[PDB]
RNA sequence: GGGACCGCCAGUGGCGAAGGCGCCCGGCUGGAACGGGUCCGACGGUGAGGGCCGAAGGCCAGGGGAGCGAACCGGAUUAGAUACCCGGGUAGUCCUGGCUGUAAAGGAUGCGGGCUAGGUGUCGGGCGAGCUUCGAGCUCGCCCGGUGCCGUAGGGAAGCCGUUAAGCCCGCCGCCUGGGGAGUACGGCCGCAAGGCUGAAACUUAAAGGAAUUGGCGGGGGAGCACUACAAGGGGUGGAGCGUGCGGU
RNA sequence: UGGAGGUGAUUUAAAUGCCAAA
């Protein structure tokens, strides 16, 4: 019939990870990060690295019979930043251009109800 | 110690907190030399 | 070698539980049939029954039995989408939450989270009165029905309509919902 | 391999560290994405009706004020 | 499996003497506002001595230890870097029973009483009128008590304050008397310790201190401009020999 | 029109003041 999967996208200020699994989440189809396609640490979070990694992952998934995906995009969350980096939308767009159908899109950043304390002291980074 | 909020102003002097620490260091030494 | 290990997998069909129709919801790959147990799949209510209104309701089904190429599921929990609840909460309104532990007629342990939104800011005593009304209605319904009927009424919106009708006596309302359900234990 | 021709339809404004770059909007004339309208950064003098040769057509420049 | 913490709603919003207090249900308990042809009958204000409460940190015994993190151990930056930045990390932060009694503990404004234009928000109670889906609901007006803003007379060096006075009057207690030496020395009391409360002189000095003005400056913001600015370009000087000017000898 | 608060951020390195004035 139709084999649908899930694309988990992890976006921070330092890197991007694109991880395609099956509908239940328990079996991995492909997994590509920014440091696997570019050679400079400075370029790992850039949008272009996101496009390259997304294209590699989409090809590997298409060869194995996946037809479309649902998307789950997240920032680090927790006691770290709640805002996704610059490579989220670029990764989302490059999946559709590569041949997959796109289902529903949502963000699953984990948000505390007044949880743990953040690193940096009571004055924070002083640069 | 007694409060002199005029001492906390920074024009023409060093920080009052560290003057206080220096005074307290100097007072420990006199106390220890007394008991001997 | 890696491409060799992929070819050993077979694809299993996942079915909805009996009282949701028992329709197909997807396929999962696995090499050994025992590894399919306890896997969880999330689907919306709109897929089960076509209606573009109930697309923010998410249901969780868990695998328990495999026979041939088919896997069968049990109801596990329900939740409303984050973007939907995040849009109801505004300034100059009041949000009332109540979290209750219940037992159905046939000894099922559930935890239920219900939410109510009022048209304006209200005093805390009125919040307590509304929460008490919610507790009474939910306890009576749980004592009255069986597990399947309770779940169906919780996702169809009937309990929320009853709660709103009863709680209009304290203050006019804007919304009333069952926010979340999780199953805690099962009969022996 | 030989690029894709695109045509300038609007000038937006100057940018860059020393004001050497212009942002424009182009419409693709060839390939898979014929007809699409995207914005780009161009170096050198340019006017409406010029034709650019793009080596790739999936990168879009960040909008300026 | 574990320890800490209760997001959005949340509001110059609420409660408390101050410090402080925010998930939900049940039990015990303190204070205040409004309504009152109820009772007592000046029983009141302030308060030297004296008493109780009191953030964080620290100390003494016994538990706990997720995250963060004085000291400390490594990696960088730098002329150096005992720091700022990055990876780790002990005490501590949490619970029970005690000690300590300190903060820009700031409304930098002690407490009670009478009086002296207005305007406009918001929280609690009461009264009147009009709606209503009959709601412990909505809108408007007035009285009392809290909590904000703009402002008349008056006050003030001015900033500003102005029925929530820093205005005019009737009370009681505390404190101050140019800048430093100094919150030090000596004596005493208190504390396990760390420390707390009390507190001079010889000598030195012509200002120290406050509010506002005009400029100049900022590794502050905005707007503009220049080939003795850059960007895009064309030609060069800096290396050699010589002409000429300057320093030195 | 003019004010009072709150939450976020803020891209390497960059020390000093001599002849004078008399
Ligand atoms: Mg890397
Ligand atoms: Mg620096
Ligand atoms: Mg003074
Ligand atoms: Mg560190
Ligand atoms: Mg305070
Ligand atoms: Mg009222
Ligand atoms: Mg008032
Ligand atoms: Mg005023
Ligand atoms: Mg002494
Ligand atoms: Mg020049
Ligand atoms: Mg140039
Ligand atoms: Mg030469
Ligand atoms: Mg200097």
DSSP A124: -
Element (H, E) at A81: none
- Establish how many alpha carbons lie within 13 A of residue A22's alpha carbon, considering only the half-sphere containing its beta carbon: 24
For residue A109, is it within any domain? yes
Say whether the B–A interface has 3 or more Cβ pairs within 8 Å: no
Pairing relationship of beta strands C109-118 and C24-30 according to DSSP bridges? unpaired
CB contact under 8 A, A24 and C14: yes
**How many other C-beta atoms can be found within 10 angstroms of the C-beta atom of residue C141?**
20
Could you tell me the residue ranges of all domains in chain C?
7-188
**Nearest-5° Cα angle at C22, C21 to C26:** 125
Residue of A nearest to C24 (CA): A1
Q: What is the resolution of this structure in A?
A: 2.7
Q: Ligand 6 centroid vs C97 CA: distance in angstroms?
A: 28
Residue A125 contacts strand F, CB under 7 A: yes
Q: Is the CB of residue A23 less than 8 Å away from at least one CB of chain C?
A: yes
Set of chain A residues whose Cβ sits within 8 Å of the Cβ of C82: 106-107
**C1’ E31 / CA C121, Å:** 27
CB contact under 8 A, A94 and D58: yes
Residue-by-residue DSSP string for A2-25 = --EEEEEEEE-SS-EEEEEEETTS
What experiment produced this structure?
cryo-EM
CA–CA gap between residue C52 and residue C158 (Å, rounded):
18
For residue A37, is it within any domain? yes
**How many other C-beta atoms can be found within 10 angstroms of the C-beta atom of residue A52?**
19
CATH code at position A17: 3.30.420.80
Residue-by-residue DSSP string for chain C = -HHHHHTT-EEEEEE--GGGT--EEEEEEESSGGGGTT-EEEEEHHHHS--TTS-SEEEEEEEEEEETTEEEEEEEEEEE-HHHHHHH--TTSEEEEEEEEEE-TT--EEEEEEEEEESS---HHHHHHHHHHHHHHHHHHHHHS-HHHHHHHHHHTHHHHHHHHHHTTTS-EEEEEEEEEEEEE---
Residue A117 contacts strand F, CB under 7 A: no
Of C61, C58, C27, nearest to C44 (Cα)?
C58
Q: Is the CB of residue C99 less than 8 Å away from at least one CB of chain A?
A: no
CA distance to A78, C14, C27, per residue, from C68 (Å): 42, 12, 13
Instruction: Count how many residues are written for chain C.
Output: 188
Q: Is the CB of residue A80 less than 8 Å away from at least one CB of chain C?
A: no
User: Which residues, in sequence order, are CB contacts of A84 under 8 Å at separation 6+?
Assistant: A11, A12, A73, A74, A75, A107, A109
**C1’ E181 / CA B36, Å:** 29
Element (H, E) at A52: helix A47-63
CA–CA gap between residue D50 and residue D44 (Å, rounded):
12
**C141 and C161 Cβ atoms separated by less than 8 Å:** no
**How many other C-beta atoms can be found within 10 angstroms of the C-beta atom of residue A32?**
23
CA–CA gap between residue A36 and residue A49 (Å, rounded):
9
Beta-carbon pairs below 8 A across chains A and C: 33
Q: Return the structure tokens found at A121.
A: 């002291």
CA–CA gap between residue C88 and residue D27 (Å, rounded):
41
Of D54, D42, D58, D60, nearest to D6 (Cα)?
D54
Of C132, C122, C134, C119, nearest to C164 (Cα)?
C134
CA–CA gap between residue C180 and residue C151 (Å, rounded):
11
Residue of A nearest to D61 (CA): A47
Burial B20-35 (b: 16+ CB within 10 A, else e): eeeeeeeeeeeeeeee
User: Which residues, in sequence order, are CB contacts of A4 under 8 Å at separation 6+?
Assistant: A23, A66, A67, A68, A69, A70, A103, C26
CA–CA gap between residue D53 and residue D6 (Å, rounded):
6
For residue A18, is it within any domain? yes
**Nearest-5° Cα angle at D61, D58 to D64:** 155
Of A106, A18, A43, nearest to C86 (Cα)?
A106
For residue A79, is it within any domain? yes
| Cα four-point dihedral sign A22, C59, C50, C175 | negative
CA distance to C99, C159, C176, D61, per residue, from C134 (Å): 10, 10, 10, 53
CA distance to A25, A72, C15, C26, C36, per residue, from C69 (Å): 19, 28, 11, 12, 11
Note down the domain range covering A62: 2-119
Say whether the C–A interface has 3 or more Cβ pairs within 8 Å: yes
Q: What are phi and psi of A125, to 5 degrees?
A: -60, 135
């Amino acid at each position: 019939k139709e084999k649908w999967g899930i694309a988990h996208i992890y976006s921070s200020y330092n890197n991007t990870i694109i991880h395609i699994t099956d509908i239940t989440g328990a079996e991995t189809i492909s997994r590509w990060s920014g440091g696997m396609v570019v050679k400079a640490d400075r370029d790992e979070p850039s949008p272009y690295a996101a496009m390259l990694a997304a294209r590699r992952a989409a090809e590997e998934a298409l060869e194995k019979g996946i037809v479309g995906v649902h998307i789950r995009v997240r920032a680090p969350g927790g006691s770290k930043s709640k805002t996704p980096g610059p490579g989220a939308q670029a990764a989302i767009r490059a999946l559709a251009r590569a041949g997959l159908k796109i289902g529903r899109v949502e963000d699953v950043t984990p948000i505390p109800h007044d949880g743990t304390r953040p690193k940096g002291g009571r004055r924070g980074r002083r640069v | 110690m007694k409060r002199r909020p005029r001492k906390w102003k920074k024009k023409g002097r060093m920080r009052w907190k560290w003057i206080k620490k220096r005074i307290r260091r100097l007072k420990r030494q006199r106390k220890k030399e007394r008991g001997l | 070698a890696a491409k060799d290990k992929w070819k050993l997998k077979q694809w299993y069909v996942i079915y909805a539980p009996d009282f949701f129709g028992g329709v197909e919801v997807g396929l999962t790959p696995a090499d050994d049939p025992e590894k399919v147990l306890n896997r969880v799949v999330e689907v919306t209510l709109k897929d089960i029954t076509g209606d573009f209104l109930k697309g923010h309701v998410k249901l969780y089904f868990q695998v328990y039995d495999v026979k041939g190429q088919n896997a069968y599921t049990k109801f596990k929990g329900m939740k409303l989408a984050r973007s939907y609840i995040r849009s109801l909460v505004r300034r100059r309104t009041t949000r009332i939450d109540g979290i209750f532990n219940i037992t159905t007629k046939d000894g099922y342990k559930l935890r239920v989270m219900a939410m109510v939104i009022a048209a304006r800011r209200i005093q805390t005593s009125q919040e307590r009165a509304i929460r008490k009304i919610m507790q009474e209605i939910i306890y009576k319904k749980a004592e009255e029905l069986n597990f399947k009927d309770f779940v169906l009424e919780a996702v169809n919106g009937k309990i929320a309509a009853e709660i709103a009708k009863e709680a209009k006596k304290i203050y006019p309302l804007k919304k009333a919902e069952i926010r979340k359900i999780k199953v805690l234990g099962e009969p022996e | 391999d030989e690029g894709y021709p695109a045509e300038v339809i609007e000038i937006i404004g100057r940018t860059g560290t020393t004001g050497d770059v212009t942002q424009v909007k182009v419409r693709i004339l060839e390939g898979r994405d014929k007809g699409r309208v995207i914005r780009r950064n161009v170096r050198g003098p340019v006017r409406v009706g010029d034709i650019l040769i793009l080596r790739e057509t999936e990168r879009e420049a960040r909008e300026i004020k």
